[PDB]
Paper text:
Melatonin receptors (MTs) are family A G protein-coupled receptors (GPCRs) expressed in the central nervous system (CNS) and peripheral tissues and are targets for melatonin, the major neurohormone involved in circadian rhythm and sleep regulation.
The structures of 2-iodomelatonin- and ramelteon-bound MT1-Gi complexes were determined with global resolutions of 3.1 and 3.3 Å, respectively. The 2-iodomelatonin-bound MT1-Gi complex shares a nearly identical overall structure with that of ramelteon-bound MT1-Gi, with root-mean-square deviation (RMSD) values of 1 Å for the Cα atoms of the whole complexes and 0.8 Å for the Cα atoms of MT1 alone. This hydrogen bond further reduces the diameter of the ligand entrance and could restrict the release of the bound agonist, as the Y1875.38A mutation led to a fast ligand dissociation rate. Interestingly, although H5.46 undergoes similar conformational changes in MT1 and MT2, its functional importance seems to be different in the two receptors, as the mutation of H2085.46 (MT2) only moderately impaired the function of MT2, but the H1955.46A (MT1) mutation caused a deleterious effect, as reflected by the low expression level of the mutant. MT1 from the Gi-coupled structures adopts an active conformation with the characteristic of TM6 outward displacement, similar to the other active GPCRs.
Author numbering:
A (entry chain B): 3 to 54, 182 to 233, 241 to 354
B (entry chain C): 3 to 340
C (entry chain E): 2 to 120, 136 to 247
D (entry chain D): 9 to 61
E (entry chain A): 23 to 223, 234 to 313
Write the structure that this text describes.
């Protein structure tokens, strides 16, 4: 049988097992968000609102819930080589803007990025929280410029509700697996307090769905 | 005038290819014809190391062939005594995004890094009895794909900014930098004598560097897709590259040529880890087909299967004495095979 | 690394006292602790032991019962409550830190010690009590066990300590062959099962003292009579 | 533009090495395998007496 | 007639086959897989094992006695077959409630799940439930409530003695275990329909609540009589028709395989390993 020294080593190993168990239990209830976006999409304002080289980290708390938001815009090497490391994040925060509907085209790049990250093998059951930033000014942008630049299939109206609805349904009609994942969509307003509340509600819904799947009760 | 530069470069490339092909050479499989195949290779899971709660991404055997360090995205570096499956150290990490881990040849230090663009050095043999950070080597502008301990005071790092660096732990400064890759350098392998090393990137090419000299010596372009793993032959005169083309290839440093290809039609998925045996007679390729294959390196035929993993086989290592082979997958399990 | 110890002194027989050891310089939570006696003109005597996290506690045969030992990680302190102090526990007490994992060096650090002045074991023999030593010669100290210390896992649980006059003992060799950190390479350990030898090559100053051979095969830990070396 | 001349110089300096026949290199590659055969525990099944696992 | 005597055999053999297959598959899935070894599945295993307890000794013996119009073995074998069938029944109907509470204080009270349902805490809850089962079935020794009824062709509970064992077993085996199911599966469904309303301006009722209340409608027709044969059977026995009675006691037995079905081939976590082990072997 074991000696004294290796018995003490086994005791140390068991203690390490216990501590690792507590750290894993603590980190299993961490709401993980992956912030994305094409460029000049105004996600800096988003992280600024939530807060008050390499990938940058943000941590905060909301209603007894700890959120870790990972912003990976600083690593322009290759998504296909490290995007699988984020398999397991609670949600993906896409922050396409609405003041770039004509400037370079850029809306098409954002839609291409949405297709690339949504119809992805790693993110099949991972929900996506779409954010439509810069809402409060394309209202007066479309008082001069029309939507005909962005969309050849639209000739309806240069009004806030109509353009917002068309962009909403256009981005929604981009995911093929309309059952394994849901795309909550927001219309980020003039620095209103609801921006964090919407994220909290969406992540609570995602957590409830994940728990139901885990129990088999779904 | 720049077209003249391009024309000279392409003429030199064509001449190098002609010199390679026209060595009056012969196929490797022809020479290794009348040798006895190793037969069916059966390895049983002697030990199963449990305790990781997330997809592990790298492991490294200690030079004593008993202690192994494993890194996982749960932000923990675990050092296991493989003989008794005992955890001897659990090091928390500043950044949970870790994809690298190295074990120093002397065993005093370890290193780990990832998407935070640094692989810090941890000192294990501390008087205070804990594990503390020795240095934070910074200066890369991309996620570190692999850093390997060249010495007790020197490390070699390969990141996703199309370059590699050689560091000095005493001063934490880039002693030498190596450039020439046009893609994310994904794998790094050190020679047995730690005089040369080989870096494999996403441009479907591999390069041989001299650490003390500091520039590319040989370049190999045989693969099609990204190269994810490279391991030296134990003799140091050859190396094997595993790619996403579902094929591994044996490359010859002596001849600057391609020696053999290990491709089977039933496999269409890439290779995440490649390692040899002590004598270089078995090449252990860790596919993302949820299993590992053992190829008879000389005869190129598959010798055995090491199935028993419930996810992609991420990391693979072989002890220096060749006593056992350890495989770690995304199911957070380490398996020892003997 | 500091282990400052207090609480000793004069107690009549049948009295009670508490010995405290405050640790400052390391991670007290992970380290196991030992309390070790030494009679005023005799050798070391293992007394107690606490593992990390106070999971397992062992006591010596002669002190089990009346003696109790405890640890408090919050303020990094180790307590030994002594009751029914007979006129035999008058001694010099030390607290010894020890970490147990593959490749560790137990008993590496020793406290300065306190003084109390009360008003089926592996017997180990050191054949030499005193021996003259030339200040420029190599000398061998032989220890002899009763039960073979070579365990089935290949480890020989033999430890060699050195105590200089007026100072706490320091670990020289652990597991019969490995030199402790900071120990000059003049010391070597060799031998075989139930016959062990510490060799000092090119002896010089700061090598005089008393050398103790201790077993760690199983509790209770026991020492030798100690060999006195004089120039 | 300087990258072009850098690549030209690299290709110039990576074209003066000695290249042996692949036949001889393969022979030397298998000589190592057939000389270290007995030191391969995973290749030849070593008796269970001296397996630490 | 022979048609009904064969129908009972058909029902019992289907129950045995399903109860063996589903429970064995659950046990293998827990054993082979490592991600399913959490504290939420242990209460499922205690439900599976219990359902196997009745599927091995009692049910095949009832199949051995059903063909005949009499009894084969005798004194001590029937008395232990009954005392084991009853134990399995109460254990299953108690682990159903255990799983309901585990799911409730994992979805609704998610914060407390780590400490209330740790590895050691669940390991003692599954033994508390079991000891309660053997403390509730135990009075069969001295009370002698186990008899072989030619009325039913099985060694079962006797309602003719201790009118109060029955009431006390009805109001603790049927009346109570359904309140904790209709409260722990109706509160999860009203909570999952409340989070959706928070962001936005139905076959999930059947999928998440109805399939888990089925045990309360198979056990009703037997316990429905239980509150009628607890009225001094010496006054109410010649009122209950056999036609409904036999159909009753067997609706309960079927619950033995119904629970295995619902906690097997409705959890995708278990079905994935079911397919993975069917392909394996
Ligand atoms: C509750 C659900 C899930 C299962 C229902 C099972 C029912 C349909 C099965 C199980 C036992 C069967 C009964 C067994 C005994 C009898 C009594 C006999 O005189 C007529 C047939 C009859 C009435 C059978 C009818 C069908 C029956 C009641
Ligand atoms: C109390 O121990 C036993 C013993 C045998 C049993 N057979 C059945 I079906 C049950 C459960 C139903 N009980 C009633 C009155 O309906 C049972 C319980």
């Amino acid at each position: 049988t074991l000696s004294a020294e290796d018995k003490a080593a086994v005791e140390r190993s068991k203690m390490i097992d216990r501590n690792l168990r507590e750290d894993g239990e603590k980190a299993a209830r961490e709401v993980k968000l992956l912030l994305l976006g094409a460029g000049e999409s105004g996600k800096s304002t988003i992280v600024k609102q939530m807060k008050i080289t390499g990938i940058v980290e943000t941590h905060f708390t909301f209603k007894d819930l700890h959120f870790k938001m990972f912003d990976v815009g600083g690593q322009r090497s290759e998504r296909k080589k490290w995007i699988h490391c984020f398999e397991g994040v609670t949600a993906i925060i896409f922050c396409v803007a609405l003041s770039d509907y004509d400037l370079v085209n850029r809306m098409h790049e954002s839609m291409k990025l949405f297709d690339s990250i949504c119809n992805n093998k790693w993110f099949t059951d991972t929900s996506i929280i779409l954010f439509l930033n810069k809402k409060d000014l394309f209202e007066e942008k479309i008082k001069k410029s029309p939507l005909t630049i962005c969309y050849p299939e639209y000739a309806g109206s240069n009004t806030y509700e109509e353009a917002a609805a068309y962009i909403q349904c256009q981005f929604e009609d981009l995911n093929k697996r309309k059952d394994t994942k849901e795309i909550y969509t927001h219309f980020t307003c003039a620095t209103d307090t609801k921006n964090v509340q919407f994220v909290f509600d969406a992540v609570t819904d995602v957590i409830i769905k994940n728990n139901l799947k885990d129990c088999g009760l779904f | 005038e720049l077209d003249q530069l391009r024309q000279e470069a392409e003429q030199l490339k064509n001449q190098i290819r002609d010199a390679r092909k026209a060595c009056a050479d012969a196929t490797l499989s022809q020479i290794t014809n009348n040798i006895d195949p190793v037969g069916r290779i059966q390895m049983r899971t002697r030990r199963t190391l449990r305790g990781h709660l997330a997809k592990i991404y790298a492991m490294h055997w200690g030079t004593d062939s008993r202690l192994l360090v494993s890194a996982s995205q749960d932000g923990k570096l675990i050092i296991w005594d493989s003989y008794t499956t005992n955890k001897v150290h659990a090091i928390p990490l500043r950044s949970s995004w870790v994809m690298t881990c190295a074990y120093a040849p002397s065993g005093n230090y370890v290193a780990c890094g990832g998407l935070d663009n640094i692989c810090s050095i941890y000192n294990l043999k501390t008087r205070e009895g804990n594990v503390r950070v020795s240095r934070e080597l910074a200066g890369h502008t991309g996620y570190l794909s692999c850093c390997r301990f060249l010495d007790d005071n020197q490390i070699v790092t390969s990141s996703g900014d199309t370059t590699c660096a050689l560091w000095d732990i005493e001063t934490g400064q880039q002693t030498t930098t190596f450039t020439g890759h046009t893609g994310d350098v994904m794998s790094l392998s050190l020679a047995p004598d730690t005089r040369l090393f080989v870096s494999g990137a996403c441009d479907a090419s591999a390069k041989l560097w001299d650490v003390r000299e500091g520039m590319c010596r040989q370049t190999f372009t045989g693969h099609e897709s990204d190269i994810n793993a490279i391991c030296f032959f134990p003799n140091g005169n050859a190396f094997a590259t595993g790619s996403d083309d579902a094929t591994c290839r044996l490359f010859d440093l002596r001849a600057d040529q391609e020696l053999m290809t290990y491709s089977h039609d039933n496999i269409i998925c890439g290779i995440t880890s490649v390692s040899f045996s002590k004598s270089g007679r078995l090449l252990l390729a860790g596919y993302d087909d949820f299993n590992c294959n053992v190829w008879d390196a000389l005869k190129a035929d598959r010798a055995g299967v090491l199935a028993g993993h419930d996810n992609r086989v991420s990391c693979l290592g072989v002890t220096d004495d060749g006593m056992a082979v350890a495989t770690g997958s995304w199911d957070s399990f380490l398996k020892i095979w003997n | 690394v500091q282990l400052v110890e207090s609480g000793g002194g004069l107690v009549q027989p049948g009295g009670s006292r508490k010995l405290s050891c405050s640790a400052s310089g390391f991670a007290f939570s992970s380290f196991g602790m030992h309390w070790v006696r030494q009679a005023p003109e005799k050798g070391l005597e293992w007394v107690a032991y606490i593992s990390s996290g106070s999971g397992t506690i062992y006591y010596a045969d002669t002190v089990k019962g009346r003696f109790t030992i405890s640890r408090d990680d919050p303020k990094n302190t180790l307590f030994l409550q002594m009751t029914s102090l007979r006129s035999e526990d008058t001694a010099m007490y030390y607290c010894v830190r020890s970490i147990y994992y593959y490749g560790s060096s137990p008993f590496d650090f020793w406290g300065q010690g306190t003084t109390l002045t009360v008003s089926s074991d592996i017997v180990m023999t050191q054949a030499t009590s005193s021996v003259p030593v030339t200040p420029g010669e190599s000398v061998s100290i032989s220890c002899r066990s009763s039960k073979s210390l070579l365990h089935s896992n290949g480890n020989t649980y033999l430890y060699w300590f050195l105590q200089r006059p007026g100072q706490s003992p320091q670990l020289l060799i652990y597991r019969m062959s490995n030199l402790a950190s900071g120990v000059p390479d003049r010391f070597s350990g060799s031998g075989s099962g139930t016959a062990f030898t510490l060799t000092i090559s090119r002896l010089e100053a700061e090598d005089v003292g008393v050398y103790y051979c201790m077993q760690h095969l199983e509790y209770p830990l026991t020492f030798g009579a100690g060999t006195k070396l004089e120039l | 533009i300087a990258q072009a001349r850098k690549l030209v110089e690299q290709l110039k300096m990576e074209a003066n090495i000695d290249r042996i026949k692949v036949s001889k290199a393969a022979a030397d590659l298998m000589a190592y395998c057939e000389a270290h055969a007995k030191e391969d525990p995973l290749l030849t099944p070593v008796p269970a007496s001296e397996n630490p696992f | 007639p022979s048609w009904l005597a064969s129908a009972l055999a058909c029902v019992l053999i289907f129950t045995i086959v399903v109860d063996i297959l589903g429970n064995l598959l659950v046990i293998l899935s827990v054993y082979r897989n490592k991600k399913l070894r959490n504290a939420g599945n242990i209460f499922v295993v205690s439900l599976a094992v219990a359902d196997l307890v009745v599927a091995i000794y009692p049910y095949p013996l009832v199949l051995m006695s059903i063909f005949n119009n009499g009894w084969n073995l005798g004194y001590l074998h029937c008395q232990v077959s009954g005392f084991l069938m009853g134990l399995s029944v109460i254990g299953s109907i108690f682990n159903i409630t255990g799983i309901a509470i585990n799911r409730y204080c994992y979805i609704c009270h998610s914060l407390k799940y780590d400490k209330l349902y740790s590895s050691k805490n669940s390991l003692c809850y599954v033994l508390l439930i079991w000891l309660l089962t053997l403390a509730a079935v135990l009075p069969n020794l001295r009370a002698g409530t186990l008899q072989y009824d030619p009325r039913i062709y099985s060694c079962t509970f006797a309602q003719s003695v201790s009118s109060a064992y029955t009431i006390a077993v009805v109001v603790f085996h049927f009346l109570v275990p359904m309140i904790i199911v209709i409260f722990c599966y109706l509160r999860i469904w009203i909570l999952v329909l409340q989070v959706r309303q928070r962001v936005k301006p139905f076959r999930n009722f059947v999928t998440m609540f109805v399939v888990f209340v089925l045990f309360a409608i198979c056990w009703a027709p037997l316990n429905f009589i239980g509150l009628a044969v607890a009225s001094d059977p010496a006054s109410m026995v010649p009122r209950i028709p056999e036609w409904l009675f036999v159909a009753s006691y067997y609706m309960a037995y079927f619950n033995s395989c119904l629970n295995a079905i619902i906690y097997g081939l409705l959890n995708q976590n278990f079905r994935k390993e079911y397919r993975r082990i069917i392909v394996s072997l």
